[PDB]
Every structure is written in structure tokens, then in C-alpha cells.
Amino acid sequence: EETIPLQTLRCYNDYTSHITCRWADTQDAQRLVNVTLIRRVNEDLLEPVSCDLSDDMPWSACPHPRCVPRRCVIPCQSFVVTDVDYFSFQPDRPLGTRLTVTLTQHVQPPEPRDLQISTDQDHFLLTWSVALGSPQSHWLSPGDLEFEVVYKRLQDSWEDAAILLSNTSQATLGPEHLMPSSTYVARVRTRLAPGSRLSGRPSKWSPEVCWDSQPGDEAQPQNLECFFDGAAVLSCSWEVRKEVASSVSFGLFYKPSPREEECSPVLREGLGSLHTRHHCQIPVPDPATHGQYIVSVQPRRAEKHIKSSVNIQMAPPSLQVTKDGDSYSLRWETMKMRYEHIDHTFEIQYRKDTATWKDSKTETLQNAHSMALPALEPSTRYWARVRVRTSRTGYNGIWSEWSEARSW
Amino acid sequence: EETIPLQTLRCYNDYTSHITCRWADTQDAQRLVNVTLIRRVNEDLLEPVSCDLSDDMPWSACPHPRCVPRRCVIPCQSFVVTDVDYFSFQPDRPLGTRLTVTLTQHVQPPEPRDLQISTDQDHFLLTWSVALGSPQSHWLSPGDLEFEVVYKRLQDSWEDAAILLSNTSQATLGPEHLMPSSTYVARVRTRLAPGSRLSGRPSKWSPEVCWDSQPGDEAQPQNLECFFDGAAVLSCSWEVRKEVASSVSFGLFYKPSPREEECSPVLREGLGSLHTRHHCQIPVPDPATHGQYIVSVQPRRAEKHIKSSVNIQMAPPSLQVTKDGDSYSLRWETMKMRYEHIDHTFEIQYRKDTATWKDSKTETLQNAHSMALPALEPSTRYWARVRVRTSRTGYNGIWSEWSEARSW
Ligand SMILES: *C1O[C@H](CO)[C@@H](O[C@@H]2O[C@H](CO)[C@@H](O[C@@H]3O[C@H](CO)[C@@H](O)[C@H](O)[C@@H]3O)[C@H](O)[C@H]2NC(C)=O)[C@H](O)[C@H]1NC(C)=O
Ligand SMILES: *C1O[C@H](CO)[C@@H](O[C@@H]2O[C@H](CO)[C@@H](O[C@@H]3O[C@H](CO)[C@@H](O)[C@H](O)[C@@H]3O)[C@H](O)[C@H]2NC(C)=O)[C@H](O)[C@H]1NC(C)=O
Ligand SMILES: *C1O[C@H](CO[C@@H]2O[C@@H](C)[C@@H](O)[C@@H](O)[C@@H]2O)[C@@H](O[C@@H]2O[C@H](CO)[C@@H](O)[C@H](O)[C@H]2NC(C)=O)[C@H](O)[C@H]1NC(C)=O
Ligand SMILES: *C1O[C@H](CO[C@@H]2O[C@@H](C)[C@@H](O)[C@@H](O)[C@@H]2O)[C@@H](O[C@@H]2O[C@H](CO)[C@@H](O)[C@H](O)[C@H]2NC(C)=O)[C@H](O)[C@H]1NC(C)=O
């Protein structure tokens, strides 16, 4: 029985005139409350029990960290078969609190249920019911309640609390509330209408209902909330699809009509995965002179500069092998660039129909058109691969594709 | 450059008439937006680039999980030293959002700071400041702001939102707000007073400040919130110290004056360790007839029933050994219970000054007053231990304490 002294309390007696009780108390509770053991004589005869400190706890164990075991001895209660006496623990001082709850001034309406939303062309009718009672209990009538519905998206926190109310168990959520492609969530609480019984906290929020809003254009930026700070900065809370942002880079432009178009910083802050909001701090030195700033969010002119003379890649040359006296040479099909004087480095590769290109000889030289070699008894061995590169101060490019293995 | 296609885009050409570009797109973004590569001719000549799908990505790598590599070929742009052409990516459809912002109607006041609480006899002065600007910026004057302070205890959630307001940067929190021994927490937000500039969301809550409230009586029950449900039940939200509850068991009593005192269920719900709240559902069939219920929370009648004949423990008997002819016997000092006929079982124990009680012989018998034994050459050996128990239908008790070792 929870209470420690009760929990650990065993009273052993002998059919003579000696009944000992052993219980304990927690040393912590001691500095707040102290209790005295009490025996039930017959009824209003709550005769107290004398108890002296003890160190040992044999009859029962104490589940506390620091207990104050006690041993109590009580006199002849004249033992006889079927004799039961009750023990209680009386606190040193009267404890408790009271509260006169005048029903009317402490009413908490029941929570709504059967929350459902039926859409009707970019409009959502949120319906619900409330179990008032059974026999027409005139105490509380539906005309005594008020409803507070809160709604948001399956992303943001309820702290933004976009509330709405109704005197009927129905609300009309539309385009002027929800935004075009977001999945919303809403719940309802039952309040006490001004015409009422009296005060009382409103019910607890009902289960929330989820639904997708009006069809819209995804892959578009949303929530262009811009809030003017004091009198020097204007912060805007951007919002774009975490997939569009990986193909379309957007920027925040602003023009105070009656033009500048970017901010020094555009910090990205990841939202609920599916979305990534951005921020920018637009400076505003003349708030009085220019109190109109039409901000916009469109594709930022993001371009990659490619320098021709640095991103070169020549075409693979031809080879056609020549064999006079002792086969060795290799022809270089230089793609005659119109009288353009540029140095070229080549990479020729050896081989054999019995080996892979990973074990070839790569003689790399400049402005050459052939090389030397000492073959063997094979005359159907592969060994024709040539790469060209810009080995001039026309600084750089990339290895050209390979030529073709002229099986000789 | 962030955008994947831009990030992974290399365009290699040959000083002839063949420039190939290779970029990729993320398969995910594809079902939302599609982009087309574009080359910058000179200015407004944004000539598009044709691109066909590819499977290989050599020139650059794609940091995505599933990419859509593409290979694009573009014609003679007549290559010559110092020739740079820019590439961009154009989305299939115009994307963007606009917002005409009028500073006055979109003002978000700065957040308060230097939040501190000075106590003054069961009163706490909450002070704070607000950085408006530097040179007297008449746009926003302190007489344009309003303050909303919220407070609670270091336990409950802010949803209960016990709000308070002020037209000055100061609030007087007192006994009629806070409760007598709880550690509170409060924060402030800056709103726009009705006399204002215009609409705008208030600032973001400032850092919270924590402080302990007025001194009081701990080890007492608090928050006796009782709320009437519809018209049949009345729930009360109890609250007691998680230390007192282990020595003092409380109950919820109720009497509709102008008596019943307990509920069938008193469910315990652990709070912030230091406290343990309870609940009870008081039934109320006549709300109109009895709209007055004075509830109370005081020490409950928790008693442990101890049945004498079941919690027996006899007294340790004497032994005084007898040695005639051949030492063996042992005397039983039966504490003559006044002509009470009850059966007793005893436990005698052997020993020696050279051994411990864990290796003794325990002959257990009924209504005996001695036993037999064959000693040895020792005459100073310990062996006197006797327990008594109730071996009758006076059902139970506990082994009595031991007797005394009559060293014979
Ligand atoms: C239940 O009874 C116990 C005593 O059996 C109470 O504890 C006792 O509390 C007093 C005052 O709080 C302690 O005495 C003080 O001791 C200091 C020196 O340590 C001295 O400066 C003071 O003048 C005074 O003598 C007393 O020692 C302490 N006893 C024990 C055993 O700790 C306990 O407070 C009672 N419970 C309640 C709720 O009152
Ligand atoms: C960018 O272009 C690609 C195509 O190259 C677009 O994906 C294509 O989308 C259509 C319709 O969403 C897919 O066709 C449909 O296929 C199903 C069978 O799978 C059939 O029932 C339909 O009648 C229709 O033919 C098409 O297969 C798909 N192509 C690929 C390669 O997946 C993509 O949507 C475009 N991006 C945007 C934002 O529009
Ligand atoms: C129940 O609600 C309707 C409609 O809504 C609310 O009315 C105000 C309380 C306002 O603050 C908004 O929340 C809603 O518009 C109430 O009907 C309106 O009553 C006013 C006159 O007081 C009238 O000018 C409007 O045209 C009415 N609107 C409609 C749609 O008929 C109605 O009075 C509420 N019931 C009670 C008992 O207050
Ligand atoms: C600034 O606050 C003081 C005191 O508080 C608020 O007044 C109301 C707005 C009310 O809803 C409560 O929040 C506070 O009491 C305002 O002074 C009170 O003004 C009324 C008359 O309008 C007067 O009867 C009270 O006695 C005044 N209280 C005190 C303590 O002097 C004060 O007007 C507020 N300033 C502005 C510009 O509104």
C-alpha cells in the first residue's frame, strides 16, 4: 500500500499480552511531515501507538535509500480467534486544501469529434459534432458553446496559431486562408460563447484532421513573407521546393516604385525536407520617402563561363600503319585546323591481340607523325591508339578520344 | 555553383567547328521542373542548346543518387583566342512570386532584451528593454509598441499561455498570479499597440527568465483545479509532493452543502518528479439542484489490517541442559500461555565451539521437551538454540527468536 510506513509495517503478537509492530519512515519526508502509528480499537477509539527508534528492519524491507526504522510495542488487546485490528498513520499536522467549485464558474465543454472535411471547389467545409449529453440536459445547451478551430500545414508549428471561430459546428476554409499546394492540418476546441454559464477553461483540442488543399502549381516559390524591421532592414522569408532549387536558382529582387535586385546575403535554412526556405535582408534607408517596395522572387541570372581556349578537346586522329623494310611507323592524321598554329602532344599505344590496353607502351612526344618499333613473328597484332593534346601556351583542354586500332 | 546542372557542366570544343557540352539533371526535380541548356551569343541572343540523353558522365561527376546525364552538341561559334561564351539553364515554365510590401503594414518590432526580475516582498518586477534604433528614428516610437508577457512554471507547457500585457517595459507579477512554492519562467514579445503604424506580426519571443516565487508551505497539496464536464462528471486535477505522498496518503472528498467523500478511481500521474498529480471523477446527477460542491483534499483513511492469530511470534525459550548417565537432553522453557491450547513446533540446534551454526543439526519436532544425543570428548561445546512456531490450525506466524547457548 504505497505509503512507505504502511507498505513496510508488520505487527507480530503472541496470544498473551505483547504485540509489537515494526514500520519505517523515509528520512526525507521527515523534514516536512512526521507520522505517528495508530491502532483502531473499535471505531472512534483511534488509540495512538508508542514507537521508539530502531536500526534493524527484519519483518519487512524498506525500498528507500535512507529509512528511519521504528519499533512499537502495544499492550494487551486480549487476543482471541477472529480478532482484527487496523493500523493507520496520523500526520503531525492537519494537511489539505479545499475549493468551492461553483459549477457554472468552472465549466469545461466536451471536446468535439467526428472531425471531417468535405471539399467543394477550392473550399473546404470542416464539420464536427459534440456529445453534450443524453436526455435534453438544459444545463448546457449548444447555444452556450463556441468553437475555436486552428489550422496550419504539415510543416509549421502550432505556435503560429492561425485561429478561426464559429458559433456553429462548421467552418468554411477557403483560398483566402490556405495556400495552393500545401497539405494542411486543423483541429478544434470547444469554448464557452460570451453568452454563457460562466468561466471555465475550454476543452482539450480534438484529434487533428489532415487534407491537401486546392490544386496548385508546385515547383514554385511560396510564402514571400516580408517584414520591415524597426527602420533600417526588411527581412523576407522565402520558400521553395527542395528539388526545384537544384535546377533553378532563385534570387530576391526589389524595386521601390513611385533597379536594385539582389541582397548581399541569401542564407538557406532547411525546412521539412520537401521544402527549403531562404532569407535576405533588404536595406531601406528612406522608409518615409519609399514605403512601397515590390519584392519578387525569380530566376537569378546564374551562368557558367566557359573559356574556349581553356576547354579544348581535339578530335581523334587516324593511324594507317606503314611497313617498309622493318614495320614500325604509325601515321598521324592531323585534323588540319585552318592555319591555326598550336602545339600538339600525342600518345601512341602498343598492344597485341593477346593483351589488354592496360599493358601497352605509351610513347608521348611533340609534333611527331610516326615512331619506331621492333615487332616479332606476329602480323595481326592490335596496336593503334592515339590521343592529342594542346601542349602549347594555349593553356589547356582535355585528352582527345582515341583513334582506331589498325590491325596490322 | 549549387544548381546541379550548372555544378556538373563541362563544355569541351575543338578549334574547328564542334563544341560538346555535358551536364546532368536530377531525376527527382524532373517531375516538377525540366530545364534546357542555353548559350549566350552576345547579349539578348540567348540561343538554346540541343541536348540528347546520355548514360555516361565522364567530364564531371554527379553528387545525386539518380542523375539524368545529357550530351549536347553545338555548332561553329568560330573559335578564336580570348572567346568566352556563357551557359545558363532555362526552366520549362516561368516560376516566381511577387509581393507589394508597404512598410507600415508589415512591421515586426524588435525583440526585448535584458530581461530580469527583481523581487519586492511577494511581488516580482519583470523588467526589460528594446533596441529601437540610434538616432531618434521617429518612424517607430516607444508609444507604438505593446508588450505581451507569458509566464508558467518549469513544468507545464506554454499552451496554457498565461498571458499579461503592458504599455510600459515592465510588469508586476504577484501572489494573484504565481503559486507559493513553484519555480516560474516567463518571456516577453513585442506587439504593436492599437495606436500604431499598421499591421505586422509581433516580434519573436525573447529569452526566458527563471525565478522561484514567494515562500510558502511545502509538503501541502496544490492546484485543486476542478472542472465540470458537460453535465454528469466533475474532474479534479490534484497535486502533491512526491515525498509527502509516501507518508501521507490523501483522498478527495466532496459535499454539496445547501457526506460522500471519495471517488471509485484516483489515478496517479507522475509530473516533474518533485510532484505527483492525482485525478478523480466525482459523479454529479443533479447539477441544477446542487450547483455547489465544496471539494477538499485531506488525509485519507488508509489502514493495514493485521489479524492477531495470523501474525504470531512466540518468545525464545530457555534451554538448561541435563546430563545424567549419558549427556543428551535439552530443556524446553515453554512460556506458559494462560491455559491456551495451541500446538508448537520447535527447532533445536547442535554445534561446537569449533564450528559455526551453518553446520548444525536441526531436529524439528512437535510438543517435545528434550531429545537424544551421543557427544564425545568435549564438555565445553556450544549447542543450544531453540525456535518455536505455531504448528496448529491457528494458521500462522513467524519463527521465534533464538534461545541461549548453554555451553555444557
Ligand atoms: C520529527 O521528529 C524529528 C526529531 O525526532 C525532527 O527533527 C529534529 O528537528 C530539530 C529542528 O528542526 C533538530 O534540532 C535542532 O538541531 C540543531 C543541531 O543539529 C540545533 O541547532 C537546533 O537548536 C535544534 O536542536 C533535531 O536535531 C532533529 N532531530 C533529528 C533526529 O534529526 C523532525 O523535524 C520532525 N518532523 C517534522 C515534520 O517536524
Ligand atoms: C521532362 O521531360 C520528361 C520526358 O522526357 C517528362 O517525363 C515524362 O512524363 C510523361 C507524363 O508525366 C510520361 O508519359 C506517360 O507515361 C505513362 C506510362 O509510364 C503513360 O500512361 C502516359 O500516357 C504517358 O505516356 C513520360 O513517360 C515521362 N518520360 C520519362 C522519360 O520518364 C517530365 O515530366 C518532364 N518534366 C516536367 C516538369 O514536365
Ligand atoms: C454566428 O456567426 C455568424 C457569422 O459570423 C461571425 O460574426 C461575428 C461574431 C464576426 O466577428 C465573425 O466571426 C463572423 O462573421 C454571425 O452573423 C453575423 O452577424 C452580424 C451582426 O452581428 C451580421 O452583420 C453579419 O452579416 C452576420 N453574418 C452572416 C454570415 O449572417 C451570427 O450572429 C453568430 N451568432 C451569434 C449568436 O453570435
Ligand atoms: C498603460 O497601462 C495602464 C494600466 O493598465 C492597463 O489599462 C487597460 C488597457 C486594462 O485593460 C489593463 O490591461 C491595465 O489596467 C493604463 O491605465 C489605466 O487607464 C484606465 C482608463 O483607460 C484607468 O481607469 C486605470 O485606472 C489606469 N490604470 C492605472 C494603473 O493608472 C494606461 O492607460 C495604459 N496606456 C495607454 C496609452 O493605453
PDB file of C-alpha atoms and ligand atoms in Angstrom, chain B residues 29-34 53 70 92-93, ligand 2:
ATOM      1  CA  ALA B  29      13.482  17.524 -59.971  1.00  0.00           C
ATOM      2  CA  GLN B  30      12.367  16.282 -63.369  1.00  0.00           C
ATOM      3  CA  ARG B  31       8.794  15.542 -62.277  1.00  0.00           C
ATOM      4  CA  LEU B  32       8.468  19.149 -61.136  1.00  0.00           C
ATOM      5  CA  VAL B  33      10.650  21.175 -63.457  1.00  0.00           C
ATOM      6  CA  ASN B  34      12.705  20.470 -66.558  1.00  0.00           C
ATOM      7  CA  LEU B  53      20.188  11.871 -73.197  1.00  0.00           C
ATOM      8  CA  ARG B  70      22.853  14.606 -71.038  1.00  0.00           C
ATOM      9  CA  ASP B  92      10.389  24.900 -68.978  1.00  0.00           C
ATOM     10  CA  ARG B  93       7.859  27.245 -67.333  1.00  0.00           C
TER      11      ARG B  93
HETATM   12  C1  LIG C   2      10.656  16.462 -68.749  1.00  0.00           C
HETATM   13  O1  LIG C   2      10.566  15.522 -69.861  1.00  0.00           O
HETATM   14  C2  LIG C   2      10.252  14.154 -69.429  1.00  0.00           C
HETATM   15  C3  LIG C   2      10.201  13.257 -70.682  1.00  0.00           C
HETATM   16  O2  LIG C   2      11.424  13.253 -71.398  1.00  0.00           O
HETATM   17  C4  LIG C   2       8.899  14.140 -68.655  1.00  0.00           C
HETATM   18  O3  LIG C   2       8.559  12.810 -68.185  1.00  0.00           O
HETATM   19  C5  LIG C   2       7.589  12.155 -68.909  1.00  0.00           C
HETATM   20  O4  LIG C   2       6.294  12.467 -68.331  1.00  0.00           O
HETATM   21  C6  LIG C   2       5.188  11.829 -69.047  1.00  0.00           C
HETATM   22  C7  LIG C   2       3.875  12.248 -68.362  1.00  0.00           C
HETATM   23  O5  LIG C   2       4.095  12.613 -66.993  1.00  0.00           O
HETATM   24  C8  LIG C   2       5.417  10.281 -69.150  1.00  0.00           C
HETATM   25  O6  LIG C   2       4.497   9.668 -70.051  1.00  0.00           O
HETATM   26  C9  LIG C   2       3.458   8.904 -69.571  1.00  0.00           C
HETATM   27  O7  LIG C   2       3.909   7.504 -69.419  1.00  0.00           O
HETATM   28  C10 LIG C   2       2.829   6.602 -68.902  1.00  0.00           C
HETATM   29  C11 LIG C   2       3.436   5.197 -68.819  1.00  0.00           C
HETATM   30  O8  LIG C   2       4.611   5.192 -67.974  1.00  0.00           O
HETATM   31  C12 LIG C   2       1.532   6.686 -69.812  1.00  0.00           C
HETATM   32  O9  LIG C   2       0.396   6.090 -69.121  1.00  0.00           O
HETATM   33  C13 LIG C   2       1.147   8.148 -70.115  1.00  0.00           C
HETATM   34  O10 LIG C   2       0.085   8.191 -71.103  1.00  0.00           O
HETATM   35  C14 LIG C   2       2.338   8.983 -70.620  1.00  0.00           C
HETATM   36  O11 LIG C   2       2.825   8.453 -71.876  1.00  0.00           O
HETATM   37  C15 LIG C   2       6.765  10.009 -69.774  1.00  0.00           C
HETATM   38  O12 LIG C   2       6.951   8.590 -69.854  1.00  0.00           O
HETATM   39  C16 LIG C   2       7.860  10.646 -68.925  1.00  0.00           C
HETATM   40  N1  LIG C   2       9.167  10.380 -69.524  1.00  0.00           N
HETATM   41  C17 LIG C   2      10.158   9.808 -68.826  1.00  0.00           C
HETATM   42  C18 LIG C   2      11.447   9.601 -69.597  1.00  0.00           C
HETATM   43  O13 LIG C   2      10.055   9.465 -67.642  1.00  0.00           O
HETATM   44  C19 LIG C   2       8.972  15.055 -67.468  1.00  0.00           C
HETATM   45  O14 LIG C   2       7.716  15.032 -66.758  1.00  0.00           O
HETATM   46  C20 LIG C   2       9.301  16.484 -67.954  1.00  0.00           C
HETATM   47  N2  LIG C   2       9.309  17.382 -66.789  1.00  0.00           N
HETATM   48  C21 LIG C   2       8.236  18.159 -66.492  1.00  0.00           C
HETATM   49  C22 LIG C   2       8.387  19.016 -65.254  1.00  0.00           C
HETATM   50  O15 LIG C   2       7.176  18.192 -67.155  1.00  0.00           O
END
